[PDB]
Structures are given as C-alpha cells and as structure tokens.
Paper text:
[name] is a molecular scaffold that simultaneously interacts with [name] and shelterin subunit TRF1. In the present study, we characterize the [name]–[name] and [name]–[name] interactions and determine the crystal structures of the N-terminal domains of [name] and [name] in complex with [name]-binding motif of [name] and [name]-binding motif of [name], respectively. To reveal the structural basis for the interactions between [name] and [name] and between [name] and [name], we crystallized the TERB1587–659–TERB22–116 and the TERB2119–220–MAJIN2–149 complexes and determined their structures using single-wavelength anomalous dispersion (SAD) method at resolutions of 3.3 and 2.9 Å, respectively.
Our data revealed that a short fragment of [name] at the C-terminus (residues 168–202) is sufficient for interaction with [name]. The TERB2MBM polypeptide forms an extended structure that wraps around the surface of MAJINNTD. The driving force for the binding of TERB2MBM to MAJINNTD is van der Waals interactions. The highly hydrophobic TERB2MBM polypeptide meanders along a hydrophobic groove on the surface of MAJINNTD and buries a total of ∼1300 Å2 surface area at the interface. The C-terminus of TERB2MBM and the loop between strands β3 and β5 of MAJINNTD contact each other and fold into an intermolecular anti-parallel β sheet that packs onto the central β sheet of MAJINNTD to further strengthen the interaction. It is worthy of noticing that, although there are three TERB2MBM–MAJINNTD complexes in one asymmetric unit in the crystal structure, two protomer complexes apparently form a heterotetramer with an extensive hydrophobic dimeric interface between two MAJINNTD molecules. Consistent with a recent study, this observation suggests that [name] and [name] could form a heterotetramer with a 2:2 stoichiometry. Again consistent with the crystal structure, substitution of Phe192TERB2 with a negatively charged bulk arginine residue completely abolished the [name]–[name] interaction in 293T cells.
Numbering used by the authors:
A (entry chain D): 174 to 209
B (entry chain A): 1 to 32, 39 to 109
Write the structure that this text describes.
Amino acid sequence: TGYISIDAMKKFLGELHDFIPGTSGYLAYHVQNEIN
Amino acid sequence: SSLKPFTYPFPETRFLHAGPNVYKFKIRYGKSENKEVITQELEDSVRVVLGNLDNLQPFATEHFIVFPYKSKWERVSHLKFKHGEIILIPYPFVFTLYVEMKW
C-alpha cells in the first residue's frame, strides 16, 4: 500500500505544445459528406 | 517553463502536440495556492503518461494522486490535424487523468 512516486516514473522529455486550432499554425479538419 | 495553465477546479479536454503526434487528454479533479507550481505538476503528470503509454498505473506527485485511464478514440479517421503544412498523427486513444488530493 502506497502509490509509486512520480520521481520514479520515467517521462517524455521533448518539446510539448497545446494543439490550439487557429493559433501557432494549427488547424483541425472534420470529414463531411455534404458541401457548401 | 511550462505550456498553458489548467482549469484547476473543473473538467477540461486538452490536445497536445508531442513528437510527430497529437494526444487527446481529458482531466477530472475530485474532492478539492500557487498557479504555476500546480501547472508544472500537471504537465509533469502528462509527460509521465506520455512516457508510459502502455504501462499506465496510479502515481503520487507533490500534492496529488493521478489515476490515468486509456479509452479508444472514437471516430479519429474523421479528423485531420495540421501544423502548417505538416500532418500530425493522432494517437488513437483518449487519456483521462483522474486527479485526487493525497490527504
């Protein structure tokens, strides 16, 4: 009983950004079956 | 040091660009000081999940117990993500982080 410390958890060390569409060149697209 | 601050009290959905991929994260806080210490702690929480994608277990941070969960991302084929000209590859799973206080 007790949870593992984050200190002992290995983690992703790279650049990490919020994907905010309409910001920093970020765009998201949803498939459609009608056009206008 | 960190990227954008979190809705602390309330549920939120965060999309994250890391390596050539987009991760869907959902955060839930249960029964619940210094804004950027908490930000850095939740970011550290994300990085941990991102570094143990197939080896999810509950962990303890300075203030919290994080229980990460992983569900199929329904209708991912419906979505395309771009960083300008660059296609971002969806990691086709939703990470739900349930954050409790240690007490």
